[PDB]
Ligand binder design. Structure first.
Ligand code: CDL
Ligand code: PC7
Ligand code: PC7
Ligand code: PC7
Ligand code: PTY
Ligand code: PTY
Ligand code: PTY
Ligand code: PTY
Lengths: 111, 438, 83, 155, 127, 77, 536
């Protein structure tokens, strides 16, 4: 019911007319399950079940936007500390409103 | 340099004159010859010439090509990984598409003109639209995603290049120009934001990797993500440093958010290629942030970590492609007992997964140490944030390994002689870089 | 502290360095710990039986120093009025 | 300090003369300069020839600094391994010099966002000294520790 | 016999799978398990988290009672009946440098205040 | 083609039947509970951040108070 | 000469794990133990040269392992007195375990791969111990972590074993993340990664907390002890190595190598860990789990002693090296008992005719655990207890921990030997060859030599304490032993249930931390990138 397809000698021919099923690469293919396939389809196409609810907005804001806000605040604090550490004047960052034009330290200058 | 460019132009040229039955053999020989030409370019690149090792121009500002530290590493990496892509791909159509893509990408790395960089890099726009949207195994949605994302980001970059060419009169890197404008800085930045997958512009990469062929995935992960750092070191940092220092808190916000949310999204994956593709996105953020510090440590660490990624992620993608050939499945839940059924494949899979988790005997360790040191030079908290959330990667990698490792299976799915030949160079390069020959 | 003055330091700095005595062990007992150290490392496995005189002398001097410490504690505590 | 356009063009001409003088004789160490081109330009990018030359000079200097720091570390390790339990006293000077070399190498080209590298905790120690002086003279109570004689093996 | 022991095979899925079925780890042998034991399903010993919290509430005061007395109620003068180890001046000055040293508690010393402020050092680097 | 959906009952008598099922609903934590536990654990993760914030605020406040006392001393004198 | 031992172990690993097809099961059963025997001779030479004769050596294999700008690190080995002692102990225990695995793992399919894992496992421990700079230590640290991951999950067809390996990996990942943070701090403000220039007299608290958090991972302390109990899923030779020397001791070795710890934190954490480990070992009914909880308690003692005195680091190391021996013996004898009885539960063990050597080794190791006078464990434990009297809070908790330790140790001894036979009437047998006898002879020789040579220089130095204070630990241990022999009830059923659940540290993680982790994953993926940002 089966036969060896591969030939190391190089005399390989595919027996498409052979009564016996070749032991080709498809021999070892996984059989698969109907419900697992539908679970895969459901999980990939989870945007179909997306619904805007106040709970969904709450979750998205509190975790994603919350983490962005926390990271931005921490980065701003670190920049302020580094400016105090280095001796630089308060730097004009994009959303900080500063009446100083200091952006890039002059290498030649001693701070 | 000239030999490398000539060979890069020769590879697509040869396909027109080959017999169409000798195409695979000729393409493999051409790829190895290009690798040797890249080694020659490294030989003729003297470290005494500190700014640029080599510069060649062929009659115009657009035809100005040159190699620096970043360019030389990335070009050697692409020339190293291309032959593996060549052997993995069958058919004159596929060979033609992949050769044209590689020629365009490799010409982009050494280009010193922003407009020529744009012209060469986006020439491979339809080729991926056709490649990822191939008849039976491709998805049109992913091709649309990648094509549209690239088009919008590259058009913004092009507008910034036009403004620079109008104001300065030149857009070549070798001519020193500085600008403080934020619109032009954002125009150059948006390309980097999209090409290096950074949240929320990372959605194109997953769909592309899953529905691209194994050679296509290998090239995409290996060098097309690294094109962002060539653009950053060559075309953004020299001119747009004032804007990166002005926006550094925002840059850190976006980078660390990309790291964290990409790590969390990786946990929800059931497809092996998607797991590797999301690991790539989390890995890109450290590179982008380390370069953005504009320090000696950051640039070197970013280019090193790019080399480490371009040696580790192609191996994982290649192993997954081999397993999919053997099993016709990519779902982790279908795949069990791989340790007993495929000991040789399992050994290399575990080795590369350890590499992706940045264990000491792997290049990712050295690269990560340098990048974290640069972040620590900026601030302690910056490094601490990245170091902690690295544990999320361990969770999903360990869960995947545990799911694959054991169980009951009735199929021997182990790699053949061709497959082992395919990954041997990557394993050797990984070891050699891991012991410190970065 | 003043009432109970420090004892004379027999061991000198060059001797303590030559015996490789850590700074924690340089506590007015260092000469005796030099003796004990040299004899202990002289006898790797019989030091428990052979090296008992040196250990005894070190423990004796340490006991005296501990009594001095307790005396200092009592003097300071009575000065503060706690007793 | 103001630069008129005439002076700027004159310096441009003089830099062209410098480039012509360098071009006359071949030099294999052209990109490893031993001396910088002195200038009073607002931005070094204004004159491209000065920019690249001084950038190469800075690179050479930093490479030398890195190798020098490795040397200093080697003698510090040898001196530590030689003396034994007397290391803290006898290796104070060599550690001092090694840490000074580390700070030079790091701080000269730290970058736009990078902070100063505090090897040996010298800047913190100075800050504590200033704080203690001000608190004592003004009658305030300092919530911070007083300055330390030695905080590391050297500095 | 360690090798060759009989095993039960888990039944194949025959019903629509829940969306979060990735929380279940099944290798094909019958007793599948949650990804983290105790996240759902049977509880070891039939003990909930509330029970464990109440038990810890009972334990913590008794466990913390020895530590709270010495650390908080006691003071350096009254902690122990003796002063810290007395050293020669050259040794004592070096040993007093260590923030994690044991000679910083010598209340007999005239540098006690500075030594105590050294012990309660900086939380983070200033620079 | 597809794998068989029929189970094997050979070992049920040895190792028990598969009749008993899980009681889990395969649903996640409630949004309200998740908010509390994220906003509790994440600060615990970021313990260095609060230490740096505390010390920086202490340093700046002491510096400002020194400056104020210096102004007072340099005004009269 | 100093390099040779690491070469021998890594050669055993490569030979057995890559060419084991040619060598065979017998080929492993020779090349493993022979190579580790040669490494034992080399380690003995190292111990004599460095410890006894005070001659430290530095071997730089190559320079610029990482050379990026100022950041420069080299692959160098410094054998200082701490390193020689840990190397000798580790190689001795690993040679014993390799002798043990020849007969124990014969019924296992991949005995060659197991031997290869064991030898690389030892090699990475020696890399950690002998490193001259922080990066070599990190290399060894991660190597032992990955080797533990590949050894605990050796039985891949068991969901429990692979989940235990995942648990170990994740917890250790968090710990080394904290260590990497501390490493970066120390490089930035000291100028180097080498321990010589690493010295700082004053260090900010953040570095100390990061070091402690990294150390409490491998040296399983409280809130980080979950993995040790689950590590029982692996084969018995793995458990002996991980609990005796390689994994648990590494945190203590790091804390002793760099004295950046704070007295207040270490003492409280150690005393709490010792008490909790003893209480957990009270409830346990597997033979192997009780010994792991005892390992936790001993780690708590060692961590606590650092707070007491300046000699605390020496006392901790002495207890470390003493503990490795009798703990390794306890695991090996327990594993042989399981094989002979085909059982893991203490109830069904009982008196049965056996080998005199194994029963004696079990008795002597348990006596060392209890604190029986004039034994190697006794001295190393009284050095801690007597010197902890100054810290009143620590001393009390350690004395109650001694009581609990005595109780469960005596209970285990009575259940294994004194109790009547409890297993069924079936043919069960494990005949022991001469190789296992050589293994237990090596352990017994280590135990005997520990008495004559000692553990610390200040072991017999006087602690000026009243006699009733000094001899108190013996009375507490004796009372615990007598109560354990009678098998009396010490706690109510509620507290016994609480201790059986190990304090519910894992159930809290399950119900809150893991659910929040996967809800964050749900928000990140389903709601956002495959939700809000996905087209119809
Ligand atoms: C962070 C906080 C948490 C975030 C969520 C919080 C709640 C969000 C509230 C907003 C919302 O509800 O969105 C739903 C809503 C979608 O409606 P729907 O109910 O989902 O279904 C309708 C479709 O048929 C749906 O059919 P469909 O399924 O076929 O379409 C799906 C589509 C639907 O998606 C969209 O339509 C828009 C997607 C981008 C929204 C832009 C940001 C909006 C939220 C940001 C601010 C939130 C704070 C509150 O998604 C996509 O496929 C496109 C995404 C691919 C591009 C990804 C680019 C990402 C950019 C920013 C990401 C959002 C931030 C999260 C991560 C942050 C990372 C830094 O989105 C919007 O309407 C956008 C509102 C804001 C738009 C920005 C302002 C537009 C500027 C107009 C200027 C006018 C010019 C005048 C001239 C005109 C003449 C030309
Ligand atoms: C399917 C696979 C089957 C085959 C298995 C192969 C087995 C491989 C054997 C493992 C090799 C272990 C050797 C590790 C040392 C690395 C070798 C090395 O790097 O060569 C060094 C020379 O150094 C040596 O030769 C080391 C001697 C090796 C033998 C020492 C004892 C062996 C014990 C192993 C302990 C090594 C721990 C090192 C941790 C990093 C090059 O010298 P440099 O000229 O200075 O090169 C510059 C440095 N850098 C590479 C960073 C650019
Ligand atoms: C430091 C200088 C010297 C370096 C020497 C390192 C020691 C040996 C290094 C050999 C290469 C390391 C990577 C080997 C491949 C990784 C995969 C592996 O180790 O094991 C494979 C297969 O193993 C192999 O075939 C090759 C292993 C040969 C020797 C491995 C030694 C242990 C690896 C060292 C850890 C690497 C360190 C990386 C971090 C520093 C899978 O094993 P399991 O998942 O447990 O399943 C096996 C089946 N069973 C269920 C029955 C257990
Ligand atoms: C508060 C934290 C303070 C201490 C932190 C250290 C421990 C933190 C939590 C440890 C989780 C690691 C354990 C693990 O790997 O979990 C699963 C692995 O499964 C998982 O992947 C679950 C994921 C859990 C890992 C992450 C959840 C905890 C995250 C902590 C904080 C959450 C968010 C914080 C910010 C990101 C295995 O557990 P078991 O089922 O019991 O297997 C043991 C063996 N036996 C079968 C015999 C019982
Ligand atoms: C619609 C979308 C948005 C809706 C939902 C948003 C809800 C989120 C709001 C809370 C977010 C967390 C709190 C951060 C913002 C606090 C308020 C901002 C103002 C601020 O900067 O104060 C600083 C907060 O401390 C800090 O520097 C940050 C401390 C908190 C960060 C650490 C806690 C989480 C740790 C997890 C890791 C994340 C960070 C990783 C680096 C301290 O004031 P100042 O002294 O700096 O002076 C600066 C003068 N205002
Ligand atoms: C002064 C002006 C004021 C502002 C006015 C704004 C007016 C709107 C401007 C929007 C311009 C953006 C253009 C992109 C449109 C989204 C793509 C179209 C959606 C779509 O259905 O395309 C399908 C697939 O596309 C896909 O699968 C791609 C998915 C979505 C692509 C992601 C967008 C790129 C990234 C967005 C931001 C990038 C950075 C921005 C700086 C193919 O449709 P079909 O071929 O079957 O035709 C059948 C017709 N139904
Ligand atoms: C909301 C968070 C910000 C999201 C960005 C996250 C991080 C991106 C940073 C990229 C780094 C370089 C980019 C330069 C600046 C880009 C955005 C910086 C933030 C920003 O919007 O600042 C604005 C200034 O920039 C501007 O005025 C121009 C903004 C960019 C324009 C957007 C599209 C431009 C496309 C142009 C194509 C190429 C054109 C070339 C001619 C307003 O801040 P402010 O200073 O006014 O302070 C007032 C506060 N009270
Ligand atoms: C020796 C040094 C210290 C060792 C560790 C000591 C830990 C002590 C913490 C526990 C003591 C205080 C507990 C808070 C008081 C709660 C008392 C009632 C508990 C309760 O009603 O709700 C519980 C909340 O979980 C909780 O109570 C979780 C609160 C725990 C705070 C986090 C501290 C780490 C705890 C790790 C070990 C402790 C394990 C037991 C907590 C169960 O919740 P539910 O599942 O029924 O909710 C329903 C699901 N919708």
């Amino acid at each position: 019911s089966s036969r060896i397809a591969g030939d190391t000698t190089g005399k390989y021919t595919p027996n498409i007319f052979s009564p016996e099923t070749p032991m080709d690469r498809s021999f070892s293919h996984v059989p698969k399950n109907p419900f697992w396939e539908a679970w895969v389809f459901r999980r990939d196409n989870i945007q179909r079940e997306f619904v805007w609810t106040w709970q969904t907005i709450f979750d998205l804001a509190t975790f994603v936007g919350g983490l962005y806000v926390a990271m931005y605040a921490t980065a701003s604090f670190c920049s302020r500390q580094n400016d105090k550490r280095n001796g630089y004047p308060e730097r004009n960052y994009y959303f900080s409103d500063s009446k100083s034009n200091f952006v890039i330290p002059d290498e030649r200058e001693f701070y | 340099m000239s030999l490398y460019l000539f060979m890069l132009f020769l590879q697509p040229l040869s396909l027109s004159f080959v017999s169409r039955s000798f195409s695979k053999i000729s393409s493999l020989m051409m790829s190895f010859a290009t690798l040797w030409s890249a080694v020659y370019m490294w030989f003729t690149s003297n470290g005494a010439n500190q700014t640029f090792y080599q510069v060649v121009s062929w009659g115009s500002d657009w035809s100005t090509f040159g190699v620096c530290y970043t360019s030389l590493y990335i070009s050697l990496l692409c020339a190293f990984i291309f032959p593996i892509c060549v052997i993995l791909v069958q058919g004159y159509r596929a060979l033609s598409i992949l050769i044209c893509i590689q020629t365009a990408v490799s010409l982009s790395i050494v280009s010193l003109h922003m407009l020529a960089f744009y012209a060469l890099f986006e020439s491979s726009l339809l080729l991926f639209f056709i490649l990822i949207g191939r008849r039976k195994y491709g998805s049109l949605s992913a091709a649309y995603n990648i094509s549209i994302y690239t088009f919008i980001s590259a058009l913004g970059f092009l507008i910034s290049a036009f403004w620079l060419n109008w104001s300065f009169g030149s857009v070549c890197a070798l001519l020193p120009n500085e600008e403080a404008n934020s619109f032009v800085a954002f125009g150059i930045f948006i390309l980097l934001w999209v090409k290096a997958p950074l949240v929320p512009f990372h959605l194109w990469l997953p769909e592309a990797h899953v529905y691209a062929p194994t050679a296509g995935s290998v090239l995409l992960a290996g060098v097309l993500l690294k094109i962002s750092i060539v653009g950053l070191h060559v075309f953004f940092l020299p001119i747009c440093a004032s804007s990166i220092v002005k926006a550094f808190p925002l840059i850190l916000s976006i980078c660390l958010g990309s790291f964290i949310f990409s790590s969390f999204s990786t946990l929800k994956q059931i497809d092996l290629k998607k797991i590797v593709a999301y690991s790539s996105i989390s890995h890109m953020a450290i590179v982008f942030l380390s370069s953005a510090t504009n320090s000696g440590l950051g640039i070197q660490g970013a280019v090193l970590y790019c080399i480490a990624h371009g040696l580790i992620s192609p191996g994982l993608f290649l192993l997954v492609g081999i397993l999919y050939k053997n099993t016709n499945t990519k779902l982790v839940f279908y795949l069990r007992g791989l340790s007993q059924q495929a000991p040789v494949w399992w050994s290399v899979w575990v080795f590369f997964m350890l590499g992706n988790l940045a264990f000491p005997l792997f290049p990712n360790f050295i690269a990560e140490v340098v990048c974290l040191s640069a972040l620590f030079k900026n601030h302690e908290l910056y490094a601490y944030a990245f170091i902690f959330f690295s544990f999320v990667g361990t969770v999903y990698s360990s869960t995947v390994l545990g799911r694959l490792k054991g169980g009951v299976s009735s199929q021997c799915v182990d790699a053949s002689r061709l497959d082992v030949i395919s990954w041997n160079p990557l394993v050797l390069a990984t070891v050699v870089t891991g012991i410190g020959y970065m | 502290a003043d009432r109970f003055p420090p004892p004379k330091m027999v061991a000198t700095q060059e001797e303590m360095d030559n015996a490789d005595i850590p700074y924690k062990y340089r506590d007015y007992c260092a000469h005796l710990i030099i003796d004990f150290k040299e004899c202990r490392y002289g006898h790797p496995l019989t030091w428990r039986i052979n090296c008992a005189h040196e250990l005894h002398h070190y423990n004796k001097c340490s006991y005296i120093e501990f009594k001095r410490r307790v005396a200092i504690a009592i003097e300071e505590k009575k000065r503060r009025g706690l007793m | 300090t103001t630069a008129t356009i005439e002076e700027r063009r004159a310096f441009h001409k003089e830099v062209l003369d410098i480039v012509q003088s360098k071009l006359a004789n071949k030099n294999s160490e052209w990109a490893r300069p031993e001396e910088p081109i002195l200038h009073n330009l607002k931005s070094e990018k204004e004159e491209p020839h000065v920019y690249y030359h001084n950038n190469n000079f800075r690179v050479t200097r930093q490479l030398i600094h890195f190798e020098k720091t490795k040397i200093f570390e080697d003698e510090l390790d040898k001196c530590m391994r030689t003396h034994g339990e007397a290391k803290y006293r006898k290796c104070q000077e060599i550690a001092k010099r090694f840490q000074a070399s580390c700070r030079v190498a790091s701080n000269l080209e730290r970058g736009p966002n990078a902070r100063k590298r505090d090897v040996g905790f010298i800047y913190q120690n100075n800050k504590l000294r200033e704080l203690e002086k001000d608190a004592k003279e003004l009658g305030l109570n300092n919530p911070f520790p007083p300055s330390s004689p030695r905080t590391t093996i050297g500095y | 016999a360690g090798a060759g022991g009989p095993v039960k095979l888990s039944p194949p899925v025959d019903k629509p799978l829940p969306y979060n079925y990735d929380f279940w780890m099944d290798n094909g042998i019958y007793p599948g398990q949650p990804i983290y034991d105790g996240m759902f399903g049977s509880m070891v010993g039939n003990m909930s988290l509330e029970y464990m919290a109440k038990g810890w509430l009972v334990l913590l005061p008794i466990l913390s009672a020895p530590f709270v007395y010495e650390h908080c109620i006691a003071d350096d003068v009254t902690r122990n009946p003796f002063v810290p180890r007395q050293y020669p001046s050259e040794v004592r000055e070096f040993l007093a440098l260590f923030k994690n040293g044991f000679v910083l508690n010598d209340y007999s010393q005239p540098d006690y205040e500075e030594m105590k402020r050294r012990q309660s050092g900086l939380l983070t680097p200033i620079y | 083609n597809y794998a068989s959906l029929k189970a094997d009952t050979s070992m049920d008598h040895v190792f028990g039947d598969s009749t008993n099922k899980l009681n889990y609903d395969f649903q996640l934590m409630s949004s309200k509970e998740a908010f509390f536990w994220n906003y509790t654990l994440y600060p615990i993760v970021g313990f260095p951040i609060f230490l740096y914030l505390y010390q920086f605020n202490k340093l700046e406040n002491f510096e400002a108070e020194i400056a104020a006392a210096k102004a007072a001393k340099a005004a009269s004198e | 000469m100093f390099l040779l031992a690491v070469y021998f172990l890594f050669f055993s690993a490569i030979a057995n794990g890559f060419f084991g097809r040619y060598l065979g099961v017998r080929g492993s059963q020779l090349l493993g133990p022979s190579a580790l025997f040669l490494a034992l001779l080399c380690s003995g030479t190292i111990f004599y040269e460095v410890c006894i004769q005070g001659c430290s050596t530095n071997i730089k294999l190559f320079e610029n392992f990482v050379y990026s700008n100022e950041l420069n690190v080299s692959a160098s080995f410094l054998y200082d007195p701490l390193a020689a002692t840990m190397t000798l102990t580790v190689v001795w225990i690993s040679c014993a375990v390799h002798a043990y695995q020849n007969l124990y793992m014969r019924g296992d399919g991949s005995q060659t791969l197991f031997t290869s894992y064991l030898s690389a496992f030892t090699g990475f421990m020696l890399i950690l111990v002998a490193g001259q700079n922080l990066v070599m230590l990190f290399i060894g640290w991660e190597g032992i972590g990955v080797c533990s991951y590949l050894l605990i999950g050796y039985y891949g067809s068991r969901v429990s074993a692979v989940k235990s390996a995942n648990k170990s990996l994740i917890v250790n990942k968090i710990s080394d993340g904290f260590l990497l943070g501390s490493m970066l701090y120390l490089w930035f403000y000291t100028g180097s990664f080498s321990y010589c220039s690493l010295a700082t007299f004053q260090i900010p608290d953040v570095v100390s907390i990061l070091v402690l958090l990294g150390a409490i991972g491998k040296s399983s302390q409280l809130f980080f002890h979950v993995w040790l109990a689950d590590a029982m899923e692996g084969p018995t030779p793995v458990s002996a190595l991980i609990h005796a020397a390689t994994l648990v001791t590494a945190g203590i070795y790091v804390l002793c190598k760099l004295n950046l710890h704070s007295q207040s934190a270490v003492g409280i954490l150690g005393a709490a860990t010792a008490l909790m480990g003893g209480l957990f070992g009270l409830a346990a009914n597997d033979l192997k789990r009780v010994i792991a909880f005892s390992t936790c308690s001993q780690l708590g003692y060692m961590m606590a002693v650092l707070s007491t005195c300046d000699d605390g680091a020496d006392f901790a190391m002495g207890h470390l090296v003493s503990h490795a021996g009798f703990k390794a013996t306890l695991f090996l004898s327990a594993g042989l008992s399981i094989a002979k009885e085909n059982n893991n539960f203490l109830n069904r063990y009982g008196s049965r005719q056996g080998s005199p050597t194994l029963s004696f080794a079990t008795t002597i190791a348990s006596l060392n655990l209890l604190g029986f006078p004039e034994l190697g464990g006794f001295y190393s434990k009284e050095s801690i207890l007597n010197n902890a009297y100054i810290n009143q809070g620590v001393s009390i908790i350690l004395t109650l921990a001694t009581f609990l330790t005595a109780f469960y140790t005596s209970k285990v001894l009575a259940q294994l030997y004194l109790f009547p036979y409890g297993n069924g009437r079936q043919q069960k047998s494990f005949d022991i060859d001469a190789t296992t006898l050589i293994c237990f002879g090596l352990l017994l020789s280590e135990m005997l030599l520990r008495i004559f040579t000692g553990s610390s220089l200040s072991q017999n130095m006087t602690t000026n304490l009243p006699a009733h204070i000094k001899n108190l630990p013996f009375w507490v241990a004796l009372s615990g032993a007598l109560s354990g022999l009678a098998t009396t009830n010490l706690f109510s059923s509620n507290f016994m249930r609480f201790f059986g659940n190990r304090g519910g540290f894992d159930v809290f993680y399950a119900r809150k931390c893991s659910n929040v982790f996967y809800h964050n994953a749900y928000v990140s993926y389903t709601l956002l990138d495959r939700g809000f940002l996905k087209l119809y």
